[PDB]
From a paper:
Human estrogen receptor alpha (hERα) belongs to the family of nuclear receptors (NRs). While agonist binding promotes the interaction of the LBD with coregulatory proteins, such as for example the interaction of hERα with the steroid receptor coactivator-2 (SRC-2) protein, binding of antagonists leads to a rearrangement of so-called helix 12 (H12), and this rearrangement precludes any further interaction with coregulators. Here, we show that the application of PROSS server algorithms to the ligand-binding domain of human estrogen receptor alpha (hERα) enabled the development of variant ERPRS* that comprises 24 amino acid substitutions and exhibits multiple improved characteristics. Crystal structures reveal several salient features, i.e. the introduction of a tyrosine corner in a helix-loop-helix segment and the formation of a novel surface salt bridge network possibly explaining the enhanced thermal stability.
Two additional variants, i.e. ERPRS*(+) and ERPRS*(−), were produced to facilitate protein crystallization and structural studies. These variants are identical to ERPRS*, but contain one or two additional AA exchanges that have been shown to improve the crystallization behavior of hERα when crystallized with small molecule agonists (in case of ERPRS*(+)) or antagonists (ERPRS*(−)). The conformation of the LBD is stabilized in either the canonical active (ERPRS*(+)) or inactive (ERPRS*(−)) conformation in these two variants, thereby considerably improving their crystallization behavior. Structures of ERPRS*(+) were determined in complex with the coactivator peptide SRC-2 and two different agonist ligands, namely either in presence of the ligand estradiol or the phytohormone genistein, and refined to resolutions of 1.45 and 1.33 Å, respectively. No pronounced changes can be detected in the overall structures of these 12 helices-containing proteins (H1–H12) as shown by the low RMSDCα values of 0.5–0.8 Å obtained upon superposition of all equivalent Cα atoms in the compared structures. This also extends to the position and conformation of the SRC-2 peptide in the estradiol and genistein complexes. In case of the ligand genistein, only a small difference in binding affinities is observed between ERWT* and ERPRS* (Kd of 160 nM versus 143 nM). Notwithstanding this, the thermodynamic parameters ΔH and TΔS differ considerably between the two proteins, with higher absolute values observed for ERWT* (ΔH = − 83.0 kJ/mol, TΔS = − 44.2 kJ/mol) than for ERPRS* (ΔH = − 66.3 kJ/mol, TΔS = − 27.2 kJ/mol). Notably, in case of ERPRS*(+), crystals grew within hours.
Residue numbers in the entry:
A (entry chain C): 687 to 696
B (entry chain D): 686 to 696
C (entry chain A): 306 to 461, 464 to 548
D (entry chain B): 305 to 548
Write the structure that this text describes.
Amino acid sequence: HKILHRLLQD
Amino acid sequence: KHKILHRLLQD
Amino acid sequence: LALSLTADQIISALLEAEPPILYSEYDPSRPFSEAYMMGLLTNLADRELVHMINWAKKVPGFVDLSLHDQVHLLESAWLEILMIGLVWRSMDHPGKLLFAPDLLLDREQGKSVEGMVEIFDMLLATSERFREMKLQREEFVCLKAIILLNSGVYTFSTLKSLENKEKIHRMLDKITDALIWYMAKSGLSLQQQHQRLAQLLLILSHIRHMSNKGMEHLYSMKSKNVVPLSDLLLEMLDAHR
Amino acid sequence: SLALSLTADQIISALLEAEPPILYSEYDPSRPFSEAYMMGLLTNLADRELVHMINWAKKVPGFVDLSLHDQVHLLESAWLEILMIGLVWRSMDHPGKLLFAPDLLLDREQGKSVEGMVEIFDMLLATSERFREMKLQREEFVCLKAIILLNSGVYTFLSSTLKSLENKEKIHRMLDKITDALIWYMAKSGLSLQQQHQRLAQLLLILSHIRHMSNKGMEHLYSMKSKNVVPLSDLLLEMLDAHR
Ligand SMILES: O=c1c(-c2ccc(O)cc2)coc2cc(O)cc(O)c12
Ligand SMILES: O=c1c(-c2ccc(O)cc2)coc2cc(O)cc(O)c12
Ligand SMILES: [Cl-]
Ligand SMILES: [Cl-]
Ligand SMILES: [Cl-]
Ligand code: NA
Ligand code: NA
Ligand code: NA
């Protein structure tokens, strides 16, 4: 799970 | 001045 | 909805979304070794990336795309976006690069890192171009949004994807409309508008070049164990490998 | 200067007349299609095209008015971008394929024969699809190629003397004239003002992608050189070396 993908959610 | 490209642009 | 905004609304939205200007971690009690300078620049990029994601979510229409398209566009554009912001911040400081207010560097300081002065020289030349053109903040924010939407847009066959791609192209056209409107409002003649539109968009060829050279350099630094990189930067960099 | 006084029609006509020939590759179907064989075909073709590119550049309005050092600088910056935009143009009529030459039409599965090449193929193919989407016209293509030649190296172009500053300003004036020519062509074709500005931007954004693919291709070519995958001509080695 990419950090960037995570940050685009919150 | 010794570059091939330099020679081709003159010729 | 995003595609129904007027030119004024688009520029206003982009101006309001501008990210904060962060400080580097620079401790002036320590000298600028290659490793320390690389650590300062990459740590700054890491912290700026969080704010870049907030900014991207405020670019009209961006959050309407799928998360895969948002990831891909940011993976393609991130260093271009950092670098265009750097050049903008440096306009008021001829001969220097304002990485942060506490990290204003000249080309000789760039020699602290192998291969970096060549990149500094290109960024400094681009800052000179911004000054020559009298680049305005409204034009800058349009260019940054264009980079985000354009840099990754060709490497995008389902229906949903074609839909997302069409949305992006329609928004790129709306930003063109906004740039022209700003130039017309500012008094430029019709010929001056198309000439300046082209001058501005050609900036993006040079920004792309500098991002590619910076990415190659960062990979080289990583491959030589010069600097540890965050998981985010490792993944951002791996998107280009 | 005479070149800086040309009309839009004169600029477009000059660029159309300067178009280089389309050369053939050495492709032989009987040869094992190895990484080394494919890369030999591509580098051999690029070498032969470079000679014709020099003749073409000398016909771009104003180019021969610059110093020889100026001309070398601009070609060293732009050469692979110019080859690649020509490749994309030739490939427009062939969805899913890259027309390196009339006898060398390659798909992405053939590109997989070379390490690191399919990624480059995918970018070039996507750019060709964009050309198709836009219905790019030959008059627009030739203006873009001239823009690449004059723009790619112009930020690093030196202006440390009055004469070199003058030449740098001449390049920027000619870039403006080529923009004028593109707009004139699109107006004559019936586009509204809004459509003209939108299309000008769409066309110039192509050049960001061309730059990207050139940089990726140059890195790949350097890797091939370092790994001794194929022999490169003296000219290619010198052009490659001008990119560090
Ligand atoms: O320019 C940068 C930046 C950078 C940092 C902050 C900015 O706002 C802009 C660029 C970060 O890491 C690098 C790492 C590199 O190896 C080379 C570089 O040029 C850079
Ligand atoms: O694309 C090319 C071409 C090429 C050849 C002819 C053209 O008209 C365009 C590109 C040449 O050598 C390469 C060599 C490489 O290592 C990678 C490449 O992508 C290329
Ligand atoms: Cl912070
Ligand atoms: Cl003359
Ligand atoms: Cl695949
Ligand atoms: Na922060
Ligand atoms: Na116009
Ligand atoms: Na055979």
